[PDB]
Scaffold this motif. Sequence first.
Motif, PDB file in Angstrom:
ATOM      1  N   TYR A 145       4.074   4.228  -3.646  1.00 50.07           N
ATOM      2  CA  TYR A 145       3.778   3.632  -4.742  1.00 50.07           C
ATOM      3  C   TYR A 145       2.685   4.041  -5.468  1.00 50.07           C
ATOM      4  O   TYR A 145       2.097   4.489  -6.808  1.00 50.07           O
ATOM      5  CB  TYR A 145       4.488   2.955  -4.506  1.00 50.07           C
ATOM      6  N   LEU A 146       1.329   3.917  -4.889  1.00 45.46           N
ATOM      7  CA  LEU A 146       0.445   3.645  -4.850  1.00 45.46           C
ATOM      8  C   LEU A 146      -0.730   4.624  -5.365  1.00 45.46           C
ATOM      9  O   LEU A 146      -1.048   5.136  -6.383  1.00 45.46           O
ATOM     10  CB  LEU A 146      -0.737   2.503  -4.268  1.00 45.46           C
ATOM     11  N   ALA A 147      -0.066   5.496  -4.413  1.00 45.23           N
ATOM     12  CA  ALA A 147      -0.277   7.113  -4.564  1.00 45.23           C
ATOM     13  C   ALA A 147      -0.110   8.125  -5.882  1.00 45.23           C
ATOM     14  O   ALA A 147      -0.639   9.176  -6.301  1.00 45.23           O
ATOM     15  CB  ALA A 147      -0.288   7.779  -3.203  1.00 45.23           C
ATOM     16  N   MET A 148       1.147   7.265  -5.970  1.00 46.89           N
ATOM     17  CA  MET A 148       1.832   7.926  -7.364  1.00 46.89           C
ATOM     18  C   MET A 148       1.203   8.017  -8.442  1.00 46.89           C
ATOM     19  O   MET A 148       0.388   8.637  -9.774  1.00 46.89           O
ATOM     20  CB  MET A 148       3.374   7.071  -7.732  1.00 46.89           C
ATOM     21  N   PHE A 149       0.045   6.777  -8.727  1.00 41.97           N
ATOM     22  CA  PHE A 149      -0.701   6.016  -9.612  1.00 41.97           C
ATOM     23  C   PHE A 149      -1.686   6.764  -9.309  1.00 41.97           C
ATOM     24  O   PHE A 149      -2.235   7.265 -10.400  1.00 41.97           O
ATOM     25  CB  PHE A 149      -0.661   4.638  -9.735  1.00 41.97           C
ATOM     26  N   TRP A 150      -2.469   7.133  -8.527  1.00 43.49           N
ATOM     27  CA  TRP A 150      -3.330   7.714  -7.871  1.00 43.49           C
ATOM     28  C   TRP A 150      -3.074   9.308  -8.542  1.00 43.49           C
ATOM     29  O   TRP A 150      -4.335   9.910  -9.058  1.00 43.49           O
ATOM     30  CB  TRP A 150      -3.972   7.569  -6.863  1.00 43.49           C
ATOM     31  N   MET A 151      -2.027  10.039  -8.514  1.00 42.90           N
ATOM     32  CA  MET A 151      -1.860  11.242  -8.793  1.00 42.90           C
ATOM     33  C   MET A 151      -1.489  11.649 -10.095  1.00 42.90           C
ATOM     34  O   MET A 151      -2.190  12.667 -10.982  1.00 42.90           O
ATOM     35  CB  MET A 151      -0.805  12.315  -8.630  1.00 42.90           C
ATOM     36  N   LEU A 152      -1.165  10.697 -10.972  1.00 42.06           N
ATOM     37  CA  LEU A 152      -1.534  10.324 -12.393  1.00 42.06           C
ATOM     38  C   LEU A 152      -2.574  10.866 -13.205  1.00 42.06           C
ATOM     39  O   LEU A 152      -3.583  10.869 -14.221  1.00 42.06           O
ATOM     40  CB  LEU A 152       0.023   9.532 -12.936  1.00 42.06           C
ATOM     41  N   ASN A 153      -3.680  10.002 -12.483  1.00 47.12           N
ATOM     42  CA  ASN A 153      -5.017   9.072 -13.055  1.00 47.12           C
ATOM     43  C   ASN A 153      -5.123  10.325 -12.520  1.00 47.12           C
ATOM     44  O   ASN A 153      -6.612  11.553 -13.156  1.00 47.12           O
ATOM     45  CB  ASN A 153      -5.984   8.471 -11.695  1.00 47.12           C
ATOM     46  N   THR A 154      -5.457  11.522 -11.350  1.00 45.08           N
ATOM     47  CA  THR A 154      -6.523  12.670 -11.015  1.00 45.08           C
ATOM     48  C   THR A 154      -6.357  13.657 -12.117  1.00 45.08           C
ATOM     49  O   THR A 154      -7.505  14.622 -12.082  1.00 45.08           O
ATOM     50  CB  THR A 154      -6.642  12.025  -9.443  1.00 45.08           C
ATOM     51  N   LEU A 155      -5.039  14.259 -12.317  1.00 39.91           N
ATOM     52  CA  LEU A 155      -4.206  15.062 -12.698  1.00 39.91           C
ATOM     53  C   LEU A 155      -4.456  14.594 -14.075  1.00 39.91           C
ATOM     54  O   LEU A 155      -5.117  15.118 -15.050  1.00 39.91           O
ATOM     55  CB  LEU A 155      -2.965  14.967 -12.306  1.00 39.91           C
ATOM     56  N   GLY A 156      -4.684  13.191 -14.603  1.00 40.39           N
ATOM     57  CA  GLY A 156      -5.063  13.017 -16.414  1.00 40.39           C
ATOM     58  C   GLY A 156      -6.843  13.291 -16.302  1.00 40.39           C
ATOM     59  O   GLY A 156      -6.558  13.425 -16.902  1.00 40.39           O
TER      60      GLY A 156
END
Lengths: 139, 739, 50, 73, 80, 69, 141, 73, 39
Positions: free
Chosen positions: D62-73
Amino acid sequence: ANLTPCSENPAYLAKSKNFLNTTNDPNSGKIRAERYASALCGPEGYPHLIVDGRFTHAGDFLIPSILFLYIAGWIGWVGRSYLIEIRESKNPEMQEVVINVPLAIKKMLGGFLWPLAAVGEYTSGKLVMKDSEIPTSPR
Amino acid sequence: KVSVDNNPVPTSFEKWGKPGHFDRTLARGPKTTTWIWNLHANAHDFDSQTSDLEDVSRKIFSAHFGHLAVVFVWLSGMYFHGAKFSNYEGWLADPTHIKPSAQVVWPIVGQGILNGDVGGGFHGIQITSGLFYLWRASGFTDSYQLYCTAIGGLVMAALMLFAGWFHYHVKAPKLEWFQNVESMMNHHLAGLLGLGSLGWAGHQIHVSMPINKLLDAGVAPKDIPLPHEFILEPSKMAELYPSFAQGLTPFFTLNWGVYSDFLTFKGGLNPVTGGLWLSDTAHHHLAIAVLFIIAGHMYRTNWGIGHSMKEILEAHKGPFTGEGHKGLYEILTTSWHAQLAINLALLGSLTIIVAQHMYAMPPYPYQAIDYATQLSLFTHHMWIGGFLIVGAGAHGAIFMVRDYDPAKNVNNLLDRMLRHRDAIISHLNWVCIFLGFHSFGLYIHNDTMRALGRPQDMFSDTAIQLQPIFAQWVQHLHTLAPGATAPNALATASYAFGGETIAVAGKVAMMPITLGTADFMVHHIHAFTIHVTALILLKGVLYARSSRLVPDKANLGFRFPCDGPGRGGTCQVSGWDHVFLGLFWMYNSLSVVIFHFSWKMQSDVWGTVSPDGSVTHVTLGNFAQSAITINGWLRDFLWAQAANVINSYGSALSAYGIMFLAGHFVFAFSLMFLFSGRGYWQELIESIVWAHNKLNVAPAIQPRALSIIQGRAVGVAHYLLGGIVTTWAFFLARSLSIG
Amino acid sequence: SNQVVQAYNGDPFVGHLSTPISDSAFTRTFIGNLPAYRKGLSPILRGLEV
Amino acid sequence: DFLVHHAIALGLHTTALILIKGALDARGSKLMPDKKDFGYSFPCDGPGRGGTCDISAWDAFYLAMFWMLNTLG
Amino acid sequence: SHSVKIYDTCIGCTQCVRACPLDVLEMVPWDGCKAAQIASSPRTEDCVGCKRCETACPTDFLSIRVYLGAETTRSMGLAY
Amino acid sequence: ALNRGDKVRIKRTESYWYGDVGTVASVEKSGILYPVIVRFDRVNYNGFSGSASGVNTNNFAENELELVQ
Amino acid sequence: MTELSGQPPKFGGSTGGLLSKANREEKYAITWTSASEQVFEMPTGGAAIMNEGENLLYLARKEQCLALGTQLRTKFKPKIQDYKIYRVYPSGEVQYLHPADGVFPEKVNEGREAQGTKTRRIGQNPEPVTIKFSGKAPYEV
Amino acid sequence: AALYTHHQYIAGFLMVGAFAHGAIFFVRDYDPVANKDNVLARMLEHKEALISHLSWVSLFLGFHTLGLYVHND
Amino acid sequence: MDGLKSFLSTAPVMIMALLTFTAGILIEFNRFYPDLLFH
Ligand code: CLA
Ligand code: CLA
Ligand code: CLA
Ligand code: CLA
Ligand SMILES: CC1=C(/C=C/C(C)=C/C=C/C(C)=C\C=C\C=C(C)\C=C\C=C(C)\C=C\C2=C(C)CCCC2(C)C)C(C)(C)CCC1
Ligand SMILES: CC1=C(C/C=C(\C)CCC[C@H](C)CCC[C@H](C)CCCC(C)C)C(=O)c2ccccc2C1=O
Ligand code: SF4
Ligand code: SF4
Ligand code: SF4
C-alpha cells in the motif's frame, strides 16, 4: 573536460560585474568574483564541481569531505561512548532524559581522538556485538 | 465575597528537574520514548491531574496570567519594532506613496536582498499586518511614544507574571470565588468591556480626534502638538471643535444635541484618508460603553436587585422542550470544558465577524488603499475564527466524555438533545448532500457545458442565471437606508452595499459589490462547507457518549484511536477523530472563503482609479463569467495570480517563493503521517534498533513509533501548516506585487 | 400533560418519537390516506395513482 | 541530471525498502509473529501492543504503491 | 463468527475476561499455572472481534488470539 | 534449575525478548508448565495505544533458556 | 428463563433504540432488581429513571446489554449484581444468555468446560504449506 | 512521449507486483523445514540487516538530494 | 538552586543550547568568511 574555466569564460565575465553583496561588506561580490575564478563553469556561467577524485579538484569535494568525516565521527563517538557510560549508574532512563552535563562535556571535549579509538574498539571487540547475543526478531 | 487560601503550593525549583510529575503514570520513569509525547499530551490536561475542582481552577487562573504575559511581551515586541527598526515617522510624512516596513534583516548569507526599497531610502521587509494604520488611528506621532509603550507593556508583562506566581503560590482563591459566575459576568460586562470602551472613547475624544483632524488638514510631522497639550491647553482643542467651549455642563443636563459637531453619525468612509470617521468611532465607543455598563448591572451579587441566572434558566420551558434549561446552571458552573466550548464558539464567530467587518467598513486611515494590509487582516482573522470554532467542537466532546453526569440533568435540553441524535445528524447530512450537489454539481455542470462548447447551457449570467435576489434586495434596503430608515445618518453603513466609489490616492477604497450568479454559487459553496464542518463536529459532540456501533465510548475516554478491527472496523470513532476530520474541513471551508474574498475584491472592487470616473480593476473583471467554472478557478485565479509568487526572485518578494514551495513540502510531508499506520513504522523502527544493537549504541530509552492518535495529530498539524503557509505566501506576494 | 412530543406508540424503546411532524393527527390521516398506505386498494390501483 | 538521477535512485531505494520490508516481515516480527497464520491482507491487530495499524504485508504494498507513482512521476 | 483460541501460556490472571464487553470469555479450572485456572471461549458466536482481550494480557505475544473469520449480524455489530 | 538473580538468554523464538538477557526473579513449584519468572529491563509492546510503558516480567519454561550467569 | 417479568423504566423515548431488526431477526432484554429509584444512562442515549424493584429493558444488541451491565455493576454504591440478559426472538422464545451458568465469568466454578483451548504456544503453530489445500485454517488444525 | 511514459508506468506496476507476490509467497508457500539453510532461509536470517541498510541508503540519498535542492533554491 | 542545574540540563534546553552554539559559530564563520563554494 568540455567546461571552460572561470578565468576566461565570457558569460562568467559578463555576470561577475554585478554579483550581489551578501554580507554587510560592500566588496563581498567582487571578492567572490575573484574567488570563484579558479573553478570551472559550463555554458551558463555558474561554477561546476569536478568530483571524480582527481586531486587537482580535491578542493571542490575531498577537502570538505574528510572534514565532515571528522565531525560526524566526533558526534557519533560522543553519542556512543556516553551511552556506554550511562549503561549503569543507578537508572539510565533519567540520565537519558536529563543530561549528566559534566559527563557530556567530558565526552564532547575528549571526542577528538575518535578514529584511533574506533580502531581500538574494533580490535578489542567492544564495538561490534556478536550475532547471537543481539536481540533479533523472530523469523 | 472573597475566599482566598494562603500559601497552598510552595515555590521550589526542584520539581523542574523531574518532568512528568503532574500525572501518575509519567512520574514513574521514562521506560519508553512515547512517554516524551505523553509529557506534552497531558501537560495542560489539568482535569486528569487533579479531580477536586479547586486545584484545577487556580491552575487555570495562573495559566491565564502566564498567557497574558506572553501576549504582553508579543505586543511589546510590536511596539518596540515600530519604535526602533521601522519607518513610522517616515510613513507618517508621506502615507500615500511610500510603504510601511517594521523589520530589518541582518545581511549574512545573502538575505540582505529581503530588505527591499519600501520608499524613502529605508530598507526592510514590508509589513502586511497593518498596525501602522492602527497607530495613526490611535494618534502616535514619533517613535519615542511607541518605545515607551513597549516599555510599559514589558512592565505589565512582568506584572502579570508576578500576579500568576502570587495567585498560585501565595494567595490562591477558593472554589466559591470561581463559582461566583454572576459577579464575574457583570464585572466583565461593566468593568472590563464597558469601562474599557469608555476609556477608548475618552482617548478617541481627546487624542485620536484632534490629531487625525489636523493630520487630515495637512500638518507635517514635527509640527503636530503633543497629545497632552490639548488637555493642558483646551483652547487648542476648542479651536478645532466648537462644542468644547461648552464644557462638561451640557452632558449632565441632557443637552447632548450641542455635542453634535464632534460625535457625528456620518457613516460611510472618510474621503480624505480612506477610513472610518474618528468622530464616528468616538461616538461609537461611547455608546458601546454606555450600553455595556447598563447591561453590567443585571445580575445580583450582594444587594438584592439583579437576576440570578438560575431562575432565568428555570423559567424557559416549553411543550417541545420538556423541563427546559433545568440543570444547565449547575452544569456551566461545575465544568470548565462546557464554558470553553461556548467561549471558543463565540470567540471564533466573533473573529470571523471581525474579518467580515474590517473589509467593507475599513476603520483605519489609509487601510483600504493598502491592499496587502486588507487581504492579510481578512484572511488571518478568518483562520483564527475557524480554528476556535473547531476547538468548540472539541471541548463539547470532552465535556460529554469526562464532565457529563447524567443523573443531574434528566429530561432537560441536554438529555433531550442526546435522546434524538439520529434525528439531528440524519437531517444534517441530508442538507450536506443536498448542498453538495447543488453547489458543486452546478460547478461541474457549467464546467462541462463550457468544455462541450455550448455556453448557452451553462449557469452564467447570459446563460441560465441564478440571480441571488435576497441579498440584492438587502443591498437595495441598505442603499435606501440613510434618509428613510436611518434619517440621522448621512452615508450608508458601508459603500459595499451601494453608493459612490471612494478613491483616495489613485486607488479604490470601496465601491459597491454587485452580486451576480457567481456570488450565488460560491455562497452556497460556503454554506455547504460550513454545514459539513458543523456535521463532523456536532456528531463528534453527540456521539461521544455512546452509539449503536460501540455503546461503551464513555469509558474508553475522549482520546482513543479505535475499539478494534471488529464490527467491520472501528478506527476513527472517538470524539477526538471528529475534531481531526473537522480540522481538514475547516481548512477547506476557509480556503474557499478567502479565495472568494481575494478574487471578488481584486476583480470587482480594487484597482486603480482614473480622473474621468472610470475604474479599472486588477484582474479586469474576471469574476463575472469566469468564476463559475472549476477551470476558471484554476486558470484565471490559481494560475494567473500565482505568477507574482513565481517570477519574484532576486527581489524583495523572494522569501515568499521559498515559503510557497515550503508550504507545498509540509503538505506533502503530512500525507506520510495521514496515510500510513503505526505498525509498519513499529516493524521498521525495531529493525533500526537491531542495527543499533549490532554496534552497542541502542538507547536504554526504548525507541518506538508514535501513537495512532499522535500519527493523526501530526498529520493534520502538518497539513494545516503546509496549506496555510502556501496560502499566506501566495496572498502576500500577490497583493504586494499589485500594490 | 402539556408536552407535545412523546414516545412512539406507547413503548419508549422503539427508536422513534411521537412528534407533531411524525405522529400528529394530521400526519397519520394524510400519510395513512396516501395511495401507498390507505387500506382497501389493490396494488394495481395504488401503483396507478403513484 | 546528476541531482535528478540521484532522486530516481532515492525513489527506487525507498520503494525497494518498503517492498523488501513487506516481503521479509511477511512471516512475522516482534509485534506479531503469527502473520503467516493471519494471511496476506488483514486490517490490523487491534489498538493493543501500541496499536498495529498497517501491520500486514499488503499494507507495505500500500505504501509502496504511492512511492512507485511518486518516483515514476 | 470469529474464532477465539486460547493457548496454554495463560497464567489465569482473568484480565481478558473482565475486559471483554460481550461475555464470551470465562474462567474454567485448570492445573497448569499458579492460579489453577484458564480462560475459555464457549460463546464465540457473540464475539465481534474487537480484540479488547488482546490489550489486557501480560504474557509475551498474548496467550489469547482472536482470528477474524466469517461475519454475521452479531459479529458485525448491527442494530438494524 | 536456576537461582534467583542469574542472567539468562531467551530462546522463545516468538517473544519480544529473543536473545536479550534477563534476571530470574523466582522459580516457582514444579507441575506447572512455565515456572521461571524472568524480569527484563526493556519493556515490550504492551498496553493500550499511547501508554507510557509495558510489562517486563514473564513466566518462561526451562528448555528454552540458555544460562550465561 | 422463558418469561420476562418486569416493568419498563421511566423514559421519554429515544431514536437510537429498537430498529426494524427487533421484530424481524432478534432483540435483547435485560432484567434487574433495583434498590431505589435512581438514574441510569442507557446506551441507547440519554438518561432514564430506574424503577423500584424488578424492571425490564429491551435493547437491540448484546453489547448494549453488557455495557448496561457494566454500568449497573460499577457506577452505583448499591452494586446491582443480579441482572439477567435474555435474547428474545420474534417467534416468542426467550434464550437465557448471561450469566447463564449462574455465577459471573470473572471467577471460576466447577461445571464449566474448556472450549477453544489449545495445548501449545503461538510459536508452535503449524505452517500454512502443509495444509495449503485442505480448506482448514492454520490456527484450527 | 506518450509511449515512453506508458511503458515506464507499466514497468513500475510490474516491479511492485513482483515484490507483492514475493510477500504472498512468504506468507503462504514458504516452508523453513525444506528450505533449510539455503539462500532463501539465509536471506530471512538477516532481514534486520537488509532493511536497515536500505533505510540507511534511503536516508543517505534523501537528506542530501533535498539538501542540495533546497540549498540551490 | 539544586533543581535549576537539572532543569538547564534536560534534553530540550541542552539541545537548544547546543544548536544555538552551533548556529552561532556557523553564522559567525559565514559573516567573516562568506560565499565559500569550495576550498
Ligand atoms: C514530501 C513528503 C515526504 C518526505 C520528505 C518523506 C521523507 C521520507 N520518507 Mg516518506 N512518504 C511520503 C511522503 C514523504 N516522505 C508519503 C506521501 C508516503 C505514503 C504514505 C510515504 C511513505 C513512506 C514509507 C513507507 C517510508 C518513508 C520513508 C521516508 C524517509 C526515508 C526516505 C528519504 O528520502 O530519506 C530522507 C529524506 C528526507 C527528505 C528527510 C529530510 C526531512 C527534513 C528536511 C529533515 C530536516 C529536519 C527538520 C527541519 C526538523 C524540523 C524542525 C521543526 C520542528 C521546526 C524520509 C524521511 C521511509 C523511512 O522513514 O524509513 C527509512 C519508509 O519506510 N516514507
Ligand atoms: C548519537 C547517537 C547515534 C548514533 C551513534 C547513531 C548511529 C547510527 N544510526 Mg542513528 N539515530 C539517532 C542517534 C544515533 N544514531 C537518533 C537520535 C535518531 C532519531 C532521530 C536516529 C535515527 C536513525 C535512523 C532512522 C537510522 C539510523 C541509522 C544509524 C546507523 C547509520 C549511520 C546513520 O545514518 O546515522 C545518521 C544519523 C541520523 C540520520 C539521525 C541522528 C541525528 C542526531 C542529530 C545525531 C545526534 C544524536 C544525539 C543528539 C547526540 C547525543 C550526544 C550525547 C552527548 C547526548 C548508525 C549506526 C540508520 C541505520 O539503521 O543504519 C543501518 C537508519 O536508518 N539512525
Ligand atoms: C481557549 C483555547 C483552548 C484551550 C485552553 C484548550 C485547552 C486544552 N485542549 Mg484544546 N483546542 C483548541 C483551543 C483550546 N484548547 C482549539 C482551538 C482546537 C482546535 C485546533 C483544540 C483542539 C484540541 C484537541 C484536538 C485536543 C485538545 C486538548 C486540550 C486539553 C489539553 C491540552 C494539551 O495537552 O495540549 C498541550 C499542548 C500541545 C500538545 C502543543 C500543541 C502544538 C501544536 C500542535 C503545534 C503548533 C503549531 C505552531 C502554531 C506552528 C509553529 C511551530 C513550528 C512550525 C515552528 C486542554 C484542556 C486535548 C485533550 O483534552 O485531550 C484529552 C486534545 O486531545 N484541544
Ligand atoms: C475531492 C474529494 C472529495 C469529495 C468529492 C468528497 C465528497 C464528499 N464528502 Mg468528503 N472528504 C474528503 C474528500 C472529498 N470528499 C477528504 C480528503 C476528507 C478528509 C478529512 C473528507 C472527509 C469527509 C467527512 C468527514 C465527511 C465527508 C462527506 C462528504 C460528502 C458530502 C456531501 C456532498 O458534498 O454531496 C455529494 C457531492 C459529491 C459526491 C461531489 C459531486 C460530484 C458529482 C455532482 C456527482 C457525480 C455525478 C454523477 C453521479 C456521475 C455519474 C456517472 C456514472 C458512471 C456513475 C461528499 C460525498 C460527509 C458525508 O458523506 O456526509 C454528508 C462527511 O461527513 N467528507
Ligand atoms: C573516495 C571517493 C569516492 C569513493 C568512495 C567509495 C567507493 C566509497 C565506498 C564506501 C564503502 C565501501 C564503505 C564501507 C563501509 C562499511 C562498513 C562496515 C562501515 C563501517 C562503519 C561503522 C562500523 C560505523 C561505526 C561508527 C563510526 C566509525 C563513528 C561513529 C560511530 C559509529 C558506530 C557510527 C567517490 C567515488 C564517491 C568520490 C571521490 C572520492
Ligand atoms: C513516520 C511515521 C511514524 C514514525 C514517527 C517518528 C519516528 C517520529 C519522528 C520524530 C523524530 C525524532 C524527529 C523529531 C521531531 C521534531 C523535528 C523535534 C524538533 C527538534 C528540533 C527543535 C531540534 C509513526 O510513528 C506513525 C504512526 C502512525 C501513523 C503514521 C506514522 C508515520 O508516518
Ligand atoms: S486500523 Fe488501526 S485504528 Fe483502525 S481499527 Fe485497526 S488498529 Fe484501530
Ligand atoms: S488475560 Fe491472558 S493470561 Fe490473563 S487469563 Fe486471559 S488469556 Fe490468560
Ligand atoms: S475480540 Fe472482543 S468480544 Fe471477542 S474475546 Fe476479545 S474482547 Fe471479547
